[PDB]
């Protein structure tokens, strides 16, 4: 916790610039997308549903 006016105003600018500098295609953020979709959590979770759905049939 312990947020202040400076810590908040400098967070709004960081969020606005992360988006603006991405519209101009100046930012490469592949080491952040390789934490959601690209990791095996997209496949291994499906490999857990593929067995929980079958365990739920008996």
């Amino acid at each position: 916790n312990n947020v202040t006016l400076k810590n908040l105003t400098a967070f709004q600018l960081l969020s606005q610039r992360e988006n603006i500098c991405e519209l101009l295609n100046l930012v490469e953020s592949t080491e952040r997308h390789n934490s959601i979709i690209n990791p095996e959590r997209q496949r291994m979770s499906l490999e857990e549903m593929k067995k929980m759905l079958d365990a739920l049939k008996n």
């Binding site: 400076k6 105003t9 709004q12 606005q16």
Partner: protein, 212 residues
Amino acid sequence: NPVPVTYPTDAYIPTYLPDDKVSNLADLKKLIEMDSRLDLYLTRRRLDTSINLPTNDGGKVQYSPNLATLIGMQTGSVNDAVYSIYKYILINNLFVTEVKLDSLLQKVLDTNAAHLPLMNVVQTVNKLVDAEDTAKLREITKLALQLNSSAQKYQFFHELSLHPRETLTHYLWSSKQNELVLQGDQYFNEDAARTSDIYSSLMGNISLLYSQ
């Protein structure tokens, strides 16, 4: 009163994403409502009521031969003693509602006042004888905020597609109005506040102060 914590407990799980592009969000809403109904049935059975000792080592007490006439038993827990004494005060309709003491109560209490509060009555009665769920609730509330972040970035870029002229001028004004806020506290840093470089509005201020 509930104790305040230092980490977010829940998240709103936003609903401004188009419900024809992202699917199974309604599945998530149904699962969350079902878990919200799967614990309202547990908390209820945590306050469960049970009637297991109306009449039925320090749990067993030997009653005096005097109190054995208002109970029907000579031994039993203290709960049975206080309960059966109250039942005797209730059956004989002794409470003043128009406790008025009976005749046998005179002996069992060794008191001739014939009128005594119930508090004193039970006073004489005594005178005669779990961790993993926190981690799960922090892991889930650590994903509904990542979802609440990606949804905000989608909301921004989608509101940038529509009306880009309106969003860009807002971004340029937020930038020209936030880079000024962050550059307002760089004047007091203890290595530029004793070198006499900033003392040559820090001059009208001393006018207001001296007048104050």
